[PDB]
Write a protein that binds this ligand. Structure first.
Ligand SMILES: OC[C@H]1O[C@@H]2OC[C@H]3O[C@H](O[C@H]4[C@H](O)[C@@H](O)[C@@H](OC[C@H]5O[C@H](O[C@H]1[C@H](O)[C@H]2O)[C@H](O)[C@@H](O)[C@@H]5O)O[C@@H]4CO)[C@H](O)[C@@H](O)[C@@H]3O
Ligand SMILES: [Ca+2]
Length: 442
């Protein structure tokens, strides 16, 4: 197949729901921490679904029209990849009624919602696993997991298969038809609650036979439901038409940040990598790629840039220029900082005096350009290096075209007429100042 058409016009906002906004005190756990606390793997801040509803104006003001939520099902941890019941929202987030309110408000605003499908593993608190821990070989669920022997032992190393050796993340046995039934049931159930797509967590830990069945199940509900795979290496395996519509585009993240933050990759090397990536992606799937600069699994963009806001803006300029759907990680738009998980999972500040408004306004501008220019959404991409510190991202439909020139040096001029991919813009000589960008259209 090809990715859903609507992805061309999508702009995602990624939220880690424990940390976006706390609107309902009745849902706070007894162990809640102050909103300004340092995140850790164990604490709870009380972010909730009503908090999301209440701040949808912020997200629409940024230019986003879709949300990617990390897991929201009942779970013991703050990140919720350890689900204990795939059929219930976590009690600290809210009820199913509140979830439907969020969906209804999103539908009213034209915002789509993509949830995080965690099918490789559950939590050790999941009712099926607890039943195996208690009843052992007599449990009906023993073969829902891969338990080496009894008793079940977590420490010092688990005697059961897990996600990357983590004792509290037992691995689901996806070779058991009963487990596959459960998983495909979860996929269909949440679609029925109104969601618009699923992001696949570590799909490479399962197998393609299962993911083909998953696509069939999802697309059987609606061909317009989006499936995006988490993939940190090449996307190609997920874009053959039988599994995903796109991947999280971590390849492009690495290219962009190597140029704008690290210094190590120059414009020639950035263009060659972008063009090679675009060529590897099959036609019909470029639009489904979910492009990003950071996530809940990376340091924050502004930290990667060592606090250099103008340089960080270069990375946003590149992000919004690329074919595929751009995604901003919550808080990055106001210049939050932090090292990798747990450091990137700080609470979103709502006191606007802490906000970096140069970043916010800048990202808003790049979003507006893409929104206004059809070619920036539906146009094919070519990357053209001009010199070691200067790159142009050209998006061309037919007769029309647009281009974003990004410069990481101390200034340059571009003779647009001498560059064949830029010549149709009829833009003459463009002068860029230090860490400058320019956005041009026919
Ligand atoms: O559901 C697991 C995990 O999946 C995504 O991230 C993939 C993840 O892969 C590697 O990390 C592994 C850790 O080294 C290992 O210790 C264990 O960690 C468990 C983690 O569980 C959750 O992580 C999710 C990510 O959020 C997903 O998007 C939780 O959020 C984390 O806080 C825990 O550390 O297993 C993972 C997965 O193999 C990479 O090192 C990591 O960079 C990448 O994020
Ligand atoms: Ca709360």
């Amino acid at each position: 197949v090809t990715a859903p058409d609507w992805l061309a016009d999508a702009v995602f906002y990624q939220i880690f729901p424990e940390r976006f906004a706390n609107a309902d005190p009745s849902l706070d756990p007894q162990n809640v921490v102050p909103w300004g606390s340092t995140p850790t793997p164990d604490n709870f801040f009380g972010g909730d679904l009503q908090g999301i509803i209440d701040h949808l104006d912020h997200i629409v003001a940024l230019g986003a029209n879709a949300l990617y939520l990390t897991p929201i099902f009942e779970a013991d941890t703050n990140h919720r990849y350890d689900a204990k019941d795939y059929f219930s929202i976590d009690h600290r987030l809210g009820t199913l009624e509140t979830f439907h309110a969020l969906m209804a408000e999103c539908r009213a605003r034209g915002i789509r919602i993509v949830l995080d499908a965690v099918l490789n593993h559950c939590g050790d608190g999941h009712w099926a696993f607890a039943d195996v821990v208690e009843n052992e070989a007599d449990s009906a669920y023993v073969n829902w997991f891969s338990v080496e022997g009894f008793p079940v032992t977590a420490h010092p190393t688990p005697n059961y298969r897990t996600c990357s050796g983590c004792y509290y993340l037992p691995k689901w046995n996806a070779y058991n038809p009963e487990v596959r039934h459960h998983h495909l049931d979860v996929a269909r159930y949440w679609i029925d609650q109104g969601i618009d797509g699923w992001r696949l967590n570590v799909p490479y830990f399962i197998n393609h036979t299962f993911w083909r069945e998953f696509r069939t199940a999802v697309k059987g509900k609606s061909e317009d439901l989006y499936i995006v795979a988490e993939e940190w290496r090449s996307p190609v395996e997920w874009l053959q038409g039988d599994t995903a519509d796109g991947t999280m585009n971590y390849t492009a993240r690495d290219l962009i940040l190597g140029f704008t933050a690290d210094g190590g990759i120059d414009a020639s090397a950035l263009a060659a990598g972008l063009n090679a990536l675009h060529a590897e992606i099959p036609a019909g799937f470029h639009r489904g790629m979910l492009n990003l600069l950071g996530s809940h699994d990376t340091e924050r963009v502004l930290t990667r840039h060592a606090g250099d806001v103008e340089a960080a803006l270069l990375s946003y300029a590149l992000l919004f220029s690329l074919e595929g759907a751009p995604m901003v990680y919550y808080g990055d738009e106001v210049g939050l900082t932090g090292d990798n998980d747990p450091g990137c999972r700080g609470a979103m500040p709502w006191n606007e005096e802490s906000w970096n408004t140069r970043l916010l306004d800048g990202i808003r501008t790049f979003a507006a350009f893409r929104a206004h220019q059809p070619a920036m959404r539906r146009g094919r991409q070519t990357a053209v290096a001009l010199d070691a510190d200067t790159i142009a991202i050209v998006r061309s439909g037919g007769d029309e075209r647009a281009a974003v020139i990004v410069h990481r040096g101390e200034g340059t001029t571009v003779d647009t007429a001498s560059i064949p991919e830029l010549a149709p813009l009829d833009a003459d000589t463009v002068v860029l100042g230090p860490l400058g960008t320019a956005s041009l259209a026919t």
